[PDB]
Design a protein around this ligand. Structure first.
Ligand SMILES: CC(C)(COP(=O)(O)OP(=O)(O)OC[C@H]1O[C@@H](n2cnc3c(N)ncnc32)[C@H](O)[C@@H]1OP(=O)(O)O)[C@@H](O)C(=O)NCCC(=O)NCCSO
Length: 145
């Protein structure tokens, strides 16, 4: 797996295929992509972009840490899961975030992926909530100080 920078526009296809296939493509054009300091990483395997992850600065009112980043659009293509593609993106992002002085990385995780974030050392906070039309989510975070 090779981790490389990618542009926001490079994430839309996999966001649409994996996360939001039953909505128009504009639903994958996350407004947070246009927030200050946003960046995106791709995981490449055998000539193909097969994993994506997007990050931007956002402080959650219920999490503690002066500088925080949110993860959006975490996805790995079927066929290429279980190869540490996603973990590789998160670890590479943690380097970038640590270098920027970020204290914490958080995600409104799909509950179906909660065990993935747990393996990466994230904790859950609060309760499960629903996010139309993409189902149950739970706040998860990782302190990176
Ligand atoms: C969740 C994920 C991005 C994981 O990507 P991946 O590239 O397969 O992850 P990975 O780095 O290989 O997996 C790391 C560890 O977590 C585990 N894992 C992966 N997906 C998991 C899940 N959904 N639930 C529990 N554990 C999971 C792996 O088995 C691995 O554990 P081991 O080291 O013990 O073998 C991918 O399954 C996916 O795209 N799922 C569908 C979309 C999704 O739910 N994305 C998360 C969005 S949060 O808003």
């Amino acid at each position: 797996i090779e981790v490389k920078p990618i542009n926001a526009e490079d994430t839309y296809e996999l966001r649409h295929r994996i996360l939001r296939p039953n909505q128009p493509i504009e639903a994958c054009m996350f407004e947070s992509d246009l927030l200050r300091g946003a960046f995106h990483l791709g995981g490449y395997y055998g000539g193909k972009l097969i994993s994506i992850a997007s990050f931007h600065q956002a402080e959650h009112s219920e999490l503690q840490g002066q500088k925080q980043y949110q993860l959006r659009g975490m996805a790995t293509l079927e066929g290429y899961r279980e190869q540490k593609a996603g973990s590789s993106l998160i670890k590479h992002a943690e380097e970038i975030l640590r270098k920027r002085g970020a204290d914490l990385l958080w995600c409104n995780a799909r509950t179906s992926a909660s065990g993935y974030y747990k393996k990466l050392g994230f904790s859950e906070q609060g309760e499960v909530f629903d996010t139309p039309p993409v189902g149950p989510h739970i706040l998860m975070y990782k302190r990176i100080t």
